[PDB]
Design a binder for this molecule. Structure first.
Ligand code: ZN
Ligand code: ZN
Ligand code: ZN
Ligand code: ZN
Ligand code: ZN
Ligand code: ZN
Ligand code: ZN
Ligand code: ZN
Ligand code: ZN
Ligand code: ZN
Ligand code: ZN
Ligand code: ZN
Ligand code: ZN
Ligand code: ZN
Ligand code: ZN
Lengths: 158, 157
C-alpha cells in the first residue's frame, strides 16, 4: 500500500526511527482514544528498529523493538496548542509498528511532529545481566526523541 | 550452552522452542521468580512466527511480542502442578519469554506445558482495512506447546 514520509529517518540512541502517514485505517480492536477511520485525518506510524547500538541491549540489528511507549506531539507553526497522541503497538500488512489514527486539529499547514520514545517499563520487561548470557547495555532513562520541525499537512493524498 | 526441553513445536501461527540452562541474573528481577542463587535453572520459550503468522502481519521468523506465556510443570508420579509465569526479556541472543525456575518436586521426569495467550485486546491491535490490513485474527484460547517426558537430571553446567 502507499505510504507518505513524515520526514527524514532518524537515528537516536539504539533506535532507527522512521515516520510515515497515509489514509486512516480500521483497527481491531479500535485502540485507546483514537478517532475512527471516518473521523480521522490520517494514520501516522513510527517504524522503530534496532540500529548497531541496539546490539548491546541484545536486539538483533534491524529487528522491531517491542514494548516501547511512544507518544507523538503535534504543534502547528505559530500556535501554542500542542496535541498529545499516544501511539499503540499494532500490525499492518507490513508488520509490527507503533501508530495512531489522528486529526490535525488546527487544520492544513506546517506542523512540528515529535515522537517521544520511552523504553520498556521496568514493570514490563527485563534484561539478562549475568556475564555468561547477559547484555552490557541498558535501557535509556529519559525518552528518546525523533522529530521533524516542518511537516506539511496539505490534506489527504488519497 | 542451551539444552532442549524437547522438539520444537509449531502451533497455529507460532513456532515454539523450549530450552533451559543455568539460572541467570535479570534486571529488574521479574515477578516472584527465584534469584540466580535460589534457582535450579532458567527456562525460555523461543517464539517466532511461522508461515501461518503471515496472515497476522508478521514476517516469518520474527519474534512475536506481547504474548502471555505460562508454563505448567508436573513430575511423573505426582499430582502436584507447579505454575511458572514467564516474562519478556532480552538475553545476549535476543527477545524471548523466560523465567528462573526451581523444580519444587526435584529431580525426575516432568510433563512441561507452555500455554500461550495472544496479546490483550487492551495491548495490541491489527489493521483490518482491505488496503493496509491483515486477514488473520488472534487466537482466543491459549495455544499449547507440550512435552510429556522432560528429564530434569540436575545442572548440566
Ligand atoms: Zn530507514
Ligand atoms: Zn536501520
Ligand atoms: Zn540507522
Ligand atoms: Zn477481537
Ligand atoms: Zn518495520
Ligand atoms: Zn513555519
Ligand atoms: Zn509501513
Ligand atoms: Zn498502523
Ligand atoms: Zn525450530
Ligand atoms: Zn516452524
Ligand atoms: Zn534499571
Ligand atoms: Zn529468538
Ligand atoms: Zn529460534
Ligand atoms: Zn537462547
Ligand atoms: Zn532468558
Amino acid at each position: 500500500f502507499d505510504e507518505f514520509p513524515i520526514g527524514e529517518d532518524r537515528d537516536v540512541g539504539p533506535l532507527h526511527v522512521g515516520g510515515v502517514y497515509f489514509q486512516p485505517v480500521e483497527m481491531h480492536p479500535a485502540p485507546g482514544a483514537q478517532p475512527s477511520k471516518e473521523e480521522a485525518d490520517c494514520h501516522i506510524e513510527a517504524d522503530i528498529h534496532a540500529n548497531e547500538a541496539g546490539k548491546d541491549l541484545g536486539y538483533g540489528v534491524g529487528d522491531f523493538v517491542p514494548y516501547l511507549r511512544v507518544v507523538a506531539f503535534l504543534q502547528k507553526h505559530g500556535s501554542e496548542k500542542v496535541q498529545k497522541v499516544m501511539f499503540a503497538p499494532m500490525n499492518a500488512g507490513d508488520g509490527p509498528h507503533y501508530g495512531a489514527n489522528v486529526k490535525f486539529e488546527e487544520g492544513l499547514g506546517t506542523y512540528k511532529v515529535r515522537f517521544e520514545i520511552a523504553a520498556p517499563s521496568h514493570d514490563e520487561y527485563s534484561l539478562h545481566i549475568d556475564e555468561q548470557t547477559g547484555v552490557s547495555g541498558r535501557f535509556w532513562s529519559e525518552p528518546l526523541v525523533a522529530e521533524w520541525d516542518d511537516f506539511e499537512w496539505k490534506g489527504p493524498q488519497w
